[PDB]
C-alpha cells in the first residue's frame, strides 16, 4: 500500500485540459491529467476519488465536489496509456465557469478515507 509521500509524488506532473479562444483570450478548463511515470503506476491506481476546490466566475472559491476519477489516454494521445484524469465537467459548478488561472486545489481520496492535497495552483 502506497504511503502519503508516494501518492503525492505520483501527482507531481500534471497537464490541464484547456480550450482557448485566441480572438477573445478566454480559456476554459475541462479537466486535469496526472502523468504516468515509470515509478507511479501503483500510487495512481490506488487513488480512485478526487476532491476539487475551484474558483468560480461569480460564486468565487468553492468546493465543487468529490467525484470518481476517470481513466483517459494521457494528453488525449491514443498511443499513450490511460491515466488518472480529473474531469471537471462532472463536478458541481452551477453552470459557472471555472477561472483557469485562479486558485485551484485538488485532493486525492484514499480507499481508507485519507485526503492529500495533490495539486495546488
Amino acid at each position, epitope marked *: 500500500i502506497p504511503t502519503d509521500q508516494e501518492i503525492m509524488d505520483a501527482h507531481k506532473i500534471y497537464f490541464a485540459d484547456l480550450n482557448f479562444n485566441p480572438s477573445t483570450g478566454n480559456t476554459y478548463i475541462n479537466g486535469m491529467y496526472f502523468a504516468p511515470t515509470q515509478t507511479n503506476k501503483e500510487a495512481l491506481d490506488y487513488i480512485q476519488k478526487y476532491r476539487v476546490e475551484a474558483t*468560480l466566475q*461569480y*460564486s*468565487g472559491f*468553492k468546493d465543487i*465536489g468529490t467525484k470518481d476519477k476517470e481513466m483517459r489516454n494521457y494528453l488525449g494521445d491514443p498511443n499513450q496509456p490511460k491515466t488518472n484524469y480529473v474531469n471537471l*465537467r*462532472s*463536478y*458541481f*459548478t*452551477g*453552470g*459557472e465557469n471555472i477561472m483557469t488561472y485562479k486558485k485551484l486545489r485538488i485532493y486525492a481520496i484514499t480507499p481508507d478515507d485519507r485526503e492529500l492535497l495533490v495539486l495546488s495552483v
Partner: antibody
Amino acid sequence: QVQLQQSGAELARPGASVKMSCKASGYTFTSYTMHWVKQRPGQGLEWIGYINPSNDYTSYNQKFKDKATLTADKSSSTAYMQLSSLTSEDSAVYYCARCWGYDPYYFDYWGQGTTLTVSS
Amino acid sequence: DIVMSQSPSLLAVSAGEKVTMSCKSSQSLLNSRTRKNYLAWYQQKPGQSPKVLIYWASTRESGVPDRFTGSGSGTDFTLTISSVQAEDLAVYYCKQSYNLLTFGAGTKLELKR
C-alpha cells in the same frame, strides 16, 4: 437544447401519496440544482425546495419539510418529488425548474407543470 | 423568512405607457462578498410557465426585450417597462435568493379601458 419534461396530470385521494418526475435533457444533470415550485389555482408562486443532483443535498421551505421529499437519479437524469399526506391544500400545479449558479441566482429553464388534484 | 412585498397588486395600463412596479424585502438582499443583489424578476402569462426577465436585480437575461429594466439595491427594487405592450400583459413576480428562496405575491398588468 435544454428541456425539462414533467409527469402527466395526477389525481389522488386525501391522505395518500404521489410521486412526480422531471425528466432533464440537453445538459449535464449533475452540474445544476433542480428546484420545485407550487402554484395553487389563481394564486402566486411558492418555492418548495431544491435538490443538488451531484451530492443529493436538499434544502426545503419549512412549510414543505414534512410534505415534500426530493430525490434525483443521476443514471436517468430525472428529479422526483414525493408528496405525502395529501390534502385539498395540495391541489395545485407543480413546476420543476433548473437553477443557474453555484448559489441560486435565477431559474433559466422550467418544466411545463404537473397538475395535482386531491379529491375523494 | 424574508418577506417579499410587491406593489401595486393590480395595474391598469395603456399601450405605449411607461410602467413601473416595486418589490420590497424585509432584509437586505445585497451580498457583501460579491456586491450583487440576489433578486430576480419573472413573467408569467396565463397557462404558461414563468420566464425569467431580470436577475442580480439589474442584469437582463439574454433574449428579453430591451424595454424591460430592473433596478434597486438592498431592500427596494423596481421593474420598469419603458413602453408596455399587449404581450406585456401578465403577472410579474419578484424573487429573492439571498437566504433560501421567496417569491413575491406578484403584480398583475391589465388593459386600461
